[PDB]
Amino acid sequence: KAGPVQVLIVKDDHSFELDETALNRILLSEAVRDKEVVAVSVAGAFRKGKSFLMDFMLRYMYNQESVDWVGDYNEPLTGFSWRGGSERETTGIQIWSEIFLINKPDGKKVAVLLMDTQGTFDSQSTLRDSATVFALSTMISSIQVYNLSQNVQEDDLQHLQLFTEYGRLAMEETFLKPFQSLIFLVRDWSFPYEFSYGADGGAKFLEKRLKVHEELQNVRKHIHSCFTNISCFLLPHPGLKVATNPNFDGKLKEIDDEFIKNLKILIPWLLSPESLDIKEINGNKITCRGLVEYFKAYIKIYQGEELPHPKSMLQATAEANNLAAVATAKDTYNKKMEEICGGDKPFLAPNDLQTKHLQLKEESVKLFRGVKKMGGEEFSRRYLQQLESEIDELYIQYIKHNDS
Numbered sequence: 001k002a003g004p005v006q007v008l009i010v011k012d013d014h015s016f017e018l019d020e021t022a023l024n025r026i027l028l029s030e031a032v033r034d035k036e037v038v039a040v041s042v043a044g045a046f047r048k049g050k051s052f053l054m055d056f057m058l059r060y061m062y063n064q065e066s067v068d069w070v071g072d073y074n075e076p077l078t079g080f081s082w083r084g085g086s087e088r089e090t091t092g093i094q095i096w097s098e099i100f101l102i103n104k105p106d107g108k109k110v111a112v113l114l115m116d117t118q119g120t121f122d123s124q125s126t127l128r129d130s131a132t133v134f135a136l137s138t139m140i141s142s143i144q145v146y147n148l149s150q151n152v153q154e155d156d157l158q159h160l161q162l163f164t165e166y167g168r169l170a171m172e173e174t175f176l177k178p179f180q181s182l183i184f185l186v187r188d189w190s191f192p193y194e195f196s197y198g199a200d201g202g203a204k205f206l207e208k209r210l211k212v213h214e215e216l217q218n219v220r221k222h223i224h225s226c227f228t229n230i231s232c233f234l235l236p237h238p239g240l241k242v243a244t245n246p247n248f249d250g251k252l253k254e255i256d257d258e259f260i261k262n263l264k265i266l267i268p269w270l271l272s273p274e275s276l277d278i279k280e281i282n283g284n285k286i287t288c289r290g291l292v293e294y295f296k297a298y299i300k301i302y303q304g305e306e307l308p309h310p311k312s313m314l315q316a317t318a319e320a321n322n323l324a325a326v327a328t329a330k331d332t333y334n335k336k337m338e339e340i341c342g343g344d345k346p347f348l349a350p351n352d353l354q355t356k357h358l359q360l361k362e363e364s365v366k367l368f369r370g371v372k373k374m375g376g377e378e379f380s381r382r383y384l385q386q387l388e389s390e391i392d393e394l395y396i397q398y399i400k401h402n403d404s
């Protein structure tokens with residue numbers, strides 16, 4: 001049980017291929033499908049400590065109610081791990097086979113999806129092979145941890161140029177900020193005396209970096225408009241044993257103390273009850289079901305050799321936004337029906353179980369027509385149809401079962 005399930009692959013021919021089956025298997029499973037989702041992503045350069053940090057996100061996700069979740073100092077780091085099989089820089093994006101169910105403060109039993117997004121952001125594998133995944137995971141995440149080395153550099157901000165172009169359009173269309181949280185995680189920070197480790201120091205740091213000369217890095221002037229939350233955490237260097245090694249055999253004892261001290265505040269600061277942010281688009285809390293719709297949409301857009309036109313992107317999330325309002329209606333109805341005549345439920349009367357259908361179907365039609373939909377009036381007629389012929393095919397399956 002549990003492990004990385006490479007979902008979105010980027011093959012040698014600029015082709016983004018999405019393995020739907022594995023994806024449905026995880027997100028569609030009957031335990032989670034209906035719970036609202038928190039989609040946490042860590043993006044950024046390969047070989048910068050991502051896997052490492054993620055294995056520690058797991059140590060916490062599992063052993064969440066126990067102070068010593070960091071593990072046994074005099075034993076070798078031994079959790080599930082994300083670095084399981086990396087024979088190469090397979091530059092796509094994997095997610096954690098197991099979802100996690102947790103209770104936020106106010107009560108909602110929400111679900112938590114972790115996604116490691118590999119890329120390079122370096123050589124020629126960038127044009128359509130880096131800000132492509134990064135683009136991807138951002139769109140669908142609710143929390144993006146942008147894992148950087150030593151400093152937020154001009155070239156790091158450059159990769160956001162895309163998101164601010166798209167976000168500006170989504171904002172015009174929707175009147176809401178496009179994205180949720182963006183967390184700048186700076187690793188091996190080594191000017192404690194200039195800005196303290198952790199979030200407070202990070203906040204002052206990130207304020208200085210983002211102010212305002214410089215080229216077309218007026219990503220500066222628009223980021224903020226795009227995310228409801230940008231924030232920053234300054235992590236220490238892990239000591240030389242960790243940094244000097246391909247695979248890190250040693251024990252927790254061998255990691256630097258001031259790194260452990262801050263990692264211990266870092267992980268709960270990101271995950272954990274109050275910190276979690278439910279995925280939200282055009283005002284609509286996405287669910288685990290709903291979120292498969294977005295994956296599906298954002299993946300037939302990143303096909304070809306050209307990153308998409310911000311205009312096509314917007315249209316991708318409109319299709320998804322629409323396909324999701326449909327998916328809930330074909331479930332609001334479905335659940336209400338399973339009450340009037342499901343399981344060992346009684347009754348009958350065709351002439352009667354018809355009006356309770358036209359009833360609930362009309363109720364469910366409003367539910368849809370009302371959901372703030374994006375795309376526009378005509379664009380979503382296509383989906384009003386899709387809806388009705390699914391509630392109707394669901395009806396049939398109830399007439400059949402009703403007969404007794």
Ligand SMILES: Nc1nc2c(ncn2[C@@H]2O[C@H](COP(=O)(O)OP(=O)(O)O)[C@@H](O)[C@H]2O)c(=O)[nH]1
Pocket residue numbers: 045046047048049050051052053083187188236237238242243245246247248
């Ligand atoms: N300097 C430094 N090295 C790290 C840190 N975390 C992990 N490493 C090491 O640097 C390499 C990065 O490995 P990994 O976590 O797989 O990075 P990823 O492939 O980008 O996810 C590993 O050999 C680690 O032992 C860090 O915070 N700072």
Ligand SMILES: [Mg+2]
Pocket residue numbers: 050051082116118
């Ligand atoms: Mg990795």
